[PDB]
């Protein structure tokens, strides 16, 4: 009971299994062939099943390029979904979508258990709703949009704003804070960044308690689509057996939505909206709903999103926005201003900025900060085109402190070691919230604004000025 290939149309293939032996949907298939003659080409290729057709035939998608496929090749049926090896063995390694290790360190044995990629989501009975503030050590995120365990978190931006630099600073700070497993998925990631990140994590020695999944842009669209679910199935083993908080990072899900749109067009369905497939909310929900806090522990996730043209009504961002618990917006104007990670104080929102979850002082502090920056945002054009001396002395006070606040949300970073070389550091929550209480009190208003860039404490700001001698 092995199938035979009967059409090829690029990524799509058709296989005519003998009836009585048809695979399920989302099942997996192997081609291994060695060429009989000189003209032929040796092939090792896997396919996934995507819908059934009229008689015996099944319509499938290919995870490696179909070049060299004859008609009438034998297809092996695995009888199961794409199976990913799960265990502690995967700590430190880099994998492809099918679970083979890309790095040359070694090969996972056949004897180990492997878990299916596709599994039903958490039920209504099993789910729970704990609330705890996740101390990330990033001065904007901890002050103005506090992250929470158990939940989907979102980073929205254009291109080249800091999304990957920031995701690296997260992975490093969490590896210092806890020996909690991390899984990183580069879904449709440029093969260049994969080299940068693998060597940065090997050279800072952060990789001992992490795993990595990659699918590059030069992969078929189906292989770009299924890479996020491999990362899910790995993080799910660590929660269910080890029972501890296991972060899942996804490098950009915009490529994932587009890979689904291209697969639907190859399957011959009819577009909608700006050409996205019909089943946009379904597929994305299927992914996003597994990220949860059931009774064993957590799988809190931090994801980044490309917003094509600074208009957020495009289907992929708009469909994503409902699922996310807390979202911070990255704007290129601040990144080019050289204050980092570029996150807008006014446009960032979270569920967790309420006194019952975060804390009484934290609520009063954050709302004073945002009111100060909002009053600065409406005062700059008068400052530009009337004389700056015309601003009232109370508004002049709001100006002076808004300058300091805007700079002191910048922070010196371990990931800057590659780009600029400086050491950086980590800030616990208490020191962020107190330092901003120091900023808002105003006794330190004598120290100059230039000092406040790229620092981790108000004592560091005193030191930098001290070098300047202030």
């Amino acid at each position: 009971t092995r199938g035979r290939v009967i059409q090829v149309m690029g990524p799509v293939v058709d296989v005519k299994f003998e009836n009585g032996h048809l695979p399920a949907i989302y099942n997996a298939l192997k081609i291994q062939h060695k060429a009989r003659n000189e003209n032929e080409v040796d092939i090792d290729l896997t396919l996934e099943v995507a819908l059934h057709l009229g008689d015996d035939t099944v319509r499938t998608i290919a995870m490696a390029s179909t070049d060299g496929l004859i008609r009438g090749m034998e297809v092996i049926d695995t009888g199961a979904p794409i199976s990913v090896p799960v265990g502690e063995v995967t700590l430190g390694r880099v994998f492809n979508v099918l679970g083979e290790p890309i790095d040359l360190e070694g090969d996972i044995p056949a004897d180990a258990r492997r878990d299916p990629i596709h599994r039903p989501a958490p039920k209504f009975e099993e789910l729970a709703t704990e609330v705890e503030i996740l101390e990330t050590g990033i001065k904007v995120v901890d002050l103005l949009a506090p992250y929470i365990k158990g939940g989907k978190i979102g980073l929205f931006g254009g291109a080249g704003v800091g999304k990957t630099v920031l995701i690296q600073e997260l992975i490093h700070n969490i590896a210092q804070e806890h020996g909690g497993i991390s899984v990183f998925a580069g879904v449709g990631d440029r093969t260049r960044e994969g080299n940068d990140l693998y060597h940065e994590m090997k050279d800072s020695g952060v990789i001992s308690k992490t795993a990595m999944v990659f699918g590059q842009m030069n992969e078929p669209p189906g292989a770009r689509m299924r890479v996020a679910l491999t990362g899910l199935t790995m993080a799910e083993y660590f929660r269910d057996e080890q029972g501890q908080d296991v972060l899942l990072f996804i490098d950009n899900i915009f490529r994932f939505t587009q890979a689904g749109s291209e697969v639907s067009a190859l399957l011959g369905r009819m577009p909608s909206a700006v050409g996205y497939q019909p089943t946009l909310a379904t597929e994305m929900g299927q992914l996003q709903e597994r990220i949860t806090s059931t009774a064993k522990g957590s799988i809190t996730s931090i994801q980044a999103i490309y917003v094509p043209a600074d208009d957020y009504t495009d289907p992929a961002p708009a469909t994503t926005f409902s699922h996310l618990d807390a979202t911070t917006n990255l704007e290129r104007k601040l990144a080019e201003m050289g204050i980092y990670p570029a996150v807008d104080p006014l446009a960032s929102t979270s569920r967790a900025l309420a006194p019952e979850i975060v804390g009484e002082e934290h609520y009063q502090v954050a709302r004073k900060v945002q009111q100060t920056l909002q009053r600065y945002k409406e005062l700059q054009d008068i400052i530009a085109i009337l004389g700056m001396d015309e601003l009232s002395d109370e508004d002049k006070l709001v100006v002076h402190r808004a300058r300091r606040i805007q700079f002191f949300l910048s922070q010196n970073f371990h990931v800057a070691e590659q780009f600029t070389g400086q050491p950086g550091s980590y800030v616990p929550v208490k020191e962020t919230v107190r330092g901003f209480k120091e900023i808002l009190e105003g006794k330190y208003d004598h120290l100059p604004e230039d000092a406040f860039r790229l620092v981790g404490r108000i004592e560091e700001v005193v030191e930098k000025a001290k070098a300047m001698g202030v």
């Binding site: 009836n19 009585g20 048809l22 695979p23 399920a24 949907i25 989302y26 819908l51 059934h52 057709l53 009229g54 008689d55 596709h118 039903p120 989501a121 958490p122 039920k123 209504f124 009975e125 789910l127 729970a128 709703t129 158990g150 939940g151 369905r269 009819m270 909608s272 909206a273 019909p278 089943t279 946009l280 909310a281 379904t282 929900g285 299927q286 996003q288 709903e289 949860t292 806090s293 009504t313 708009a318 926005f321 409902s322 699922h323 929102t349």
Partner: protein, 474 residues
């Protein structure tokens, strides 16, 4: 015969051979145990939309007919439990036994059977009850951007419905399982799940279940409407129902209409909402008022689904993203929120203070666009400043705690008659908290009067009784 064989499987659609004596809309049960509605009886191949996970089904799996039209089991047992649209429980409390079944698709009450609407539905939201009245059998639309507090207004409306026999319903369409759990626990904490049912189909469920979830929601309410008890139905979001229907139609190969929705979208929504109206005294005087919710991108209400729905409903309530992020809570805009059936159901005591309040907010909202100077004209302009400032202070509400009606009337009277005008603006809120408890202790005769008369307290002692509180406030 009864049996047939599946012979295609799409992305949740299927087609089946056999089933020769099937009928359109019949529920069909597959061997796996998921069930499907037979949408199209074409010449040889029955189209069979699958509700639930479809991965297990293969070509040649048997498919069989239940013998019944699409129906949800109903009874008195359901109240206090959480069920999926097909009517099975998800809470974990065990099986539920209901002895009656209602077709989800039915003829609504005809134009002979209906009535005019005249008895109000007290929400406990100050701004809704004061300025945008609702009544049993009204259809009313709450519209606004994401993260604007709409579900807070729904849960405030479903709590504070205790003595009034408003058997209520909440329908969760595509929602996050964590928020459905959070709301169910908030209902359980406030002692409010004795009189309400909760229906859920979540994003992991395929789109046909989302499309069916509102129809089975109203079909539960129809038992109460026939028998004679009042009802309320709330939908978490109708826009996601529109998106689920679009996906279902396009997988069935139908061509799009304007702005890539099918045109059948107006028939779908107009079918669903216009079953919500008050029956006649001959048929039991029941009710089935409904609260659709719909979301607007950027806050533009001129888009296709908003204007389509605004045509069917008898009012709109507009929630401002701009005010809500400024922190005015709950945020309602006086210019753009109005109801057609309102003005009749509202009680006589409220009618006197409601008209003055409506003019007060309408006049202050434009004048606030010019207000920041402090010295502009003489007191004539300022009085509108002073009144508008105290008005906006009094209309804000604490999160998730609903207000009682006779104290709601008495605070609006206190505001709209000018007793607050000397009271300093900074401490205006604290006045309400102290007043509610004091008025219970010292003012009970006024509460009995409103409960007796539907009318404002006897005006002679009304000032004196309010003055004793005003002195007691410090």
């Amino acid at each position: 015969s009864d049996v047939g064989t599946v012979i295609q499987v799409g992305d949740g659609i299927a087609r089946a051979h056999g089933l020769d004596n099937v009928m359109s809309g019949e529920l069909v049960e597959f061997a796996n145990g998921v069930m499907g509605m037979a949408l199209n009886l074409e010449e040889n191949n029955v189209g069979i939309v699958i509700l639930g996970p479809y991965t297990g089904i293969k070509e040649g799996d048997e498919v069989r007919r239940t013998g019944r039209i699409m129906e949800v089991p109903v009874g008195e047992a359901l109240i206090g439990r959480v069920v999926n649209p097909l009517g099975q429980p998800v809470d974990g409390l065990g099986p539920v036994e209901t002895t009656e079944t209602r077709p989800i698709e039915s003829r609504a009450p005809g134009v002979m059977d209906r009535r005019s609407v005249h008895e109000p539905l007290q929400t406990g939201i100050k701004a809704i009850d004061a300025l945008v009245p609702i009544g049993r059998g009204q259809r009313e639309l709450i519209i606004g951007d994401r993260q604007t507090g709409k579900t807070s207004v729904a849960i405030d409306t479903i709590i504070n419905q205790k003595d009034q026999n408003m058997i209520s319903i909440y329908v969760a369409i595509g929602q996050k399982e964590s928020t459905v759990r959070t709301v169910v626990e908030t209902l359980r904490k406030h002692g409010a799940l004795d009189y309400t049912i909760v229906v859920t189909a979540s994003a992991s469920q395929p789109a046909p279940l989302l499309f069916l979830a509102p129809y089975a929601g109203v079909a539960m309410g129809e038992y109460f409407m026939y028998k004679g008890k009042h009802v309320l139905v709330v939908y978490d979001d109708l826009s996601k129902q529109a998106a689920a229907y679009r996906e279902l139609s396009l997988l069935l190969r139908r061509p799009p209409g304007r702005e890539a929705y099918p045109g059948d979208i107006f028939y779908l929504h107009s079918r669903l909402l216009e079953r919500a109206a008050k029956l006649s005294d001959a048929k039991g005087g029941g009710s089935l008022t409904a609260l659709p919710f719909v979301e607007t991108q950027a806050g533009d209400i001129s888009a296709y689904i908003p204007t389509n729905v605004i045509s069917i409903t008898d009012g709109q309530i507009f929630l401002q993203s701009d005010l809500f992020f400024s922190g005015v809570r709950p945020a309602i805009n006086a210019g753009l929120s109005v109801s057609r059936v309102g003005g009749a159901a509202q009680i006589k005591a409220m009618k006197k203070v409601a008209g003055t309040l409506r003019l007060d907010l309408a006049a202050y909202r434009e004048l606030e666009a010019f207000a920041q100077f402090g010295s502009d004209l003489d007191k004539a302009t300022q009085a509108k400043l002073a009144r508008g400032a105290r008005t906006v202070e009094v209309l804000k509400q604490d999160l998730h705690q609903p207000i009682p009606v006779e104290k709601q009337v008495l605070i609006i009277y206190a505001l709209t008659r000018g007793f607050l005008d000397d009271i300093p603006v900074e401490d205006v809120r604290r006045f309400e908290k102290e007043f509610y408890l004091f008025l219970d202790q010292n003012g009970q005769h006024l509460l009995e009067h409103i409960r007796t008369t539907k009318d404002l307290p006897n005006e002679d002692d009304l000032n004196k009784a309010i003055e004793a509180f005003k002195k007691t406030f410090v």
